[PDB]
Amino acid sequence: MDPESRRMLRVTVKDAIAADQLFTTLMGDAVEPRRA
DNA sequence: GTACCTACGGCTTATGATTCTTCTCGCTTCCGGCGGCATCGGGATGCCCGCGTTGCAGGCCA
């Protein structure tokens, strides 16, 4: 938190997608793990 | 020395909603009794004749 040495980060509102809809679905949470 | 909060996932149980069972209002109108009279087919009653019912004794069956 040094105003001359810190490195913050900014969030954007670029797009409005349905990721939050699949956040808690028990179906999207089961199909999303495709890390293979 | 001690108490109270939620996320990660599944089955159930504690209560407001919709299709299937049931309880029975409305009378009115076409339809079903209801009674009287002419009609017709059956049959009970009588006589005749042969067949259906029954007793005896034997051979067959459950």
Separation between Cα atoms, residue A33 and residue A17, nearest integer Å: 19
CB proximity A30–strand B (7 Å threshold):
no
Q: Straight-line distance from CA A22 to C1' B19, in Å?
A: 35
Dist. CA A36–CA A32, nearest whole Å: 11
**What does residue A28 show for φ and ψ, rounded to 5 degrees?**
-65, -35
Closest amino acid to nucleotide B10 (CA–C1'): A26
Token pair listed for A2: 């040094």
Look-up of token digits 């670029």: A14
To one decimal place, what's the resolution in Å?
6.6
**Is the CB of A26 within 7 Å of strand B?**
yes
Whole-number Å distance between alpha carbons of A6 and A18: 33
Cβ of residue A32 near strand B, that is under 7 Å?
A: no
Residue A11 tokens, joined: 């969030």
Per DSSP (E only), the strands in chain A are none
Whether A4 and A11 have beta carbons less than 8 Å apart is answered as no
How long, in residues, is chain A?
A: 36
